[PDB]
Design an enzyme around this catalytic site. Sequence first.
Site, PDB file in Angstrom:
ATOM      1  N   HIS A  80      33.133  40.365  39.908  1.00 16.93           N
ATOM      2  CA  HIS A  80      33.647  39.975  38.618  1.00 16.93           C
ATOM      3  C   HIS A  80      33.140  40.933  37.532  1.00 16.93           C
ATOM      4  O   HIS A  80      33.871  41.471  36.740  1.00 16.93           O
ATOM      5  CB  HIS A  80      33.270  38.526  38.319  1.00 16.93           C
ATOM      6  N   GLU A  81      31.811  41.167  37.529  1.00 15.79           N
ATOM      7  CA  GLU A  81      31.233  42.031  36.549  1.00 15.79           C
ATOM      8  C   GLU A  81      31.672  43.508  36.716  1.00 15.79           C
ATOM      9  O   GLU A  81      31.918  44.179  35.753  1.00 15.79           O
ATOM     10  CB  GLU A  81      29.711  42.025  36.619  1.00 15.79           C
ATOM     11  N   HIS A  84      34.948  44.020  34.936  1.00 19.28           N
ATOM     12  CA  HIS A  84      34.703  44.322  33.496  1.00 19.28           C
ATOM     13  C   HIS A  84      34.230  45.765  33.310  1.00 19.28           C
ATOM     14  O   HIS A  84      34.636  46.445  32.374  1.00 19.28           O
ATOM     15  CB  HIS A  84      33.692  43.331  32.874  1.00 19.28           C
ATOM     16  N   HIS A  99      39.482  37.689  29.885  1.00 20.86           N
ATOM     17  CA  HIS A  99      40.018  37.906  31.218  1.00 20.86           C
ATOM     18  C   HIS A  99      41.553  37.888  31.139  1.00 20.86           C
ATOM     19  O   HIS A  99      42.151  36.893  31.517  1.00 20.86           O
ATOM     20  CB  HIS A  99      39.544  36.814  32.167  1.00 20.86           C
TER      21      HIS A  99
HETATM   22 ZN   LIG Z   1      33.969  37.691  32.805  1.00 20.77          ZN
END
Ligand SMILES: [Zn+2]
Length: 183
Positions: A80-81, A84, A99
């Site tokens: 997830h990170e 980003h 998101h």
């Molecule tokens: Zn996030």
Amino acid sequence: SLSLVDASWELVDPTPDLQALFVQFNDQFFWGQLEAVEVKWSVRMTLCAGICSYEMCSIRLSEPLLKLRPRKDLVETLLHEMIHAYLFVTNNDKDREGHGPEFCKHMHRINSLTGANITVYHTFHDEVDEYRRHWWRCNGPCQHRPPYYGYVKRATNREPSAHDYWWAEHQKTCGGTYIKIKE
Ligand SMILES: [Zn+2]
Ligand SMILES: [Zn+2]
């Protein structure tokens, strides 16, 4: 082949190797493009399971929140990170929402390749998070400062202010503005 899901996915990893996972995932899912991103454990971070910070991009993962969780939680948080981070490194972080479609494209792609379930939302300590749901992040340099990395998360809708006892130092050492990001 790129599948991540087996019997151990659901189980704690006694001895996770964060740097190895980061190197693997950079190679397998992000075309090698996150070479200059720094990923580390944080031993005191408890407000968030994972964060990023941007200058160079840094990722931190919560040892208190993740060390005794099933390995899927470490892996899904890390990926997830890394999404980003990828949007940052590639100057594609212009979506209005945290998101947006650009995040979700990579999330779907990696889930498809791996069988994983990266999500836009957090999937553990449901009740703690559900109540402590008003979130701000400082857009100043304290973003890089452990153990909060710019975040404030409250069970009531009360923004950081001078009536916080920690305020004066923040204004003096950092001076950024808190931006509301979740309610
Ligand atoms: Zn996030
Ligand atoms: Zn700050």
